[PDB]
Amino acid sequence: TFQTSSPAHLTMPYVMPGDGEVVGVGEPVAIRFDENIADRGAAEKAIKITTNPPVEGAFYWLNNREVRWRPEHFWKPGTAVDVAVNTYGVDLGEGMFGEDNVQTHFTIGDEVIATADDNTKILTVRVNGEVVKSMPTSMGKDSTPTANGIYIVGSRYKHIIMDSSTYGVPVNSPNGYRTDVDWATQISYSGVFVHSAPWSVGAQGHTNTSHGCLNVSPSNAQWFYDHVKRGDIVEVVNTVGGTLPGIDGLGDWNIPWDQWRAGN
């Protein structure tokens, strides 16, 4: 296929997960363009996802530039996935053409599902259905609760600073904070993490004390950092919070399948 010259600006796709990565059973395919896409159908038609074993899936647009593809249920462990974004020279609407093709391979690892149950204040990690860790946890206080729902594991940090001023509450104020945190596994774009919380170890398993993050012991947070990977699942249940938004960025599985497949 040849490129067509156009006075309108080209757009380049970017695919996640990373080429050659092993990811968990919750990882969606993500195709993010550096422009808004006027002809979403043309973009979807140009994206060929092949799986082994073969499984059906569907596209859903997270916003005007980024489309997600996933099956109805979590991936089968061991599945190999090929993503062919064949957008080179494709008219994506209003004179905007794909700048290039992109392709990636990724594979699905073990099924890793960690369930945080507010009724028990325990985060239980299951690997292919078997409990391997039972972690006392302290979730968000009643006034700043942890949302229920299915969270996809994202990035991880050996050390990071959590600072209330980044959302508009000064550190110096009564409810502000600036906190050095170890072993932080991100599970929502809204900023929810599983992380080390030495200051709440006595509350873990008993009382919710956090701003919404899942506090666990230093040892358990490091285990989680070492053994839980991008695309693994954290499910929160029975809190007094609401539900994680489906368009959070890592909240894809909270959209019911009929709404996901209906697309947008």
Ligand SMILES: *C(=O)[C@@H]([C@@H]1N=C(C(=O)O)[C@@H](S[C@@H]2CN[C@H](C(=O)Nc3cccc(C(=O)O)c3)C2)[C@@H]1C)[C@@H](C)O
């Ligand atoms: C884990 O705890 C994690 C963060 N911490 C959070 C927190 O401190 O609340 C949440 S993010 C949460 C989402 N909305 C609020 C917010 O924006 N509050 C607020 C209050 C006063 C003024 C304003 C404003 O002017 O915009 C906003 C914050 C999440 C679980 C890590 C990062 O600590």
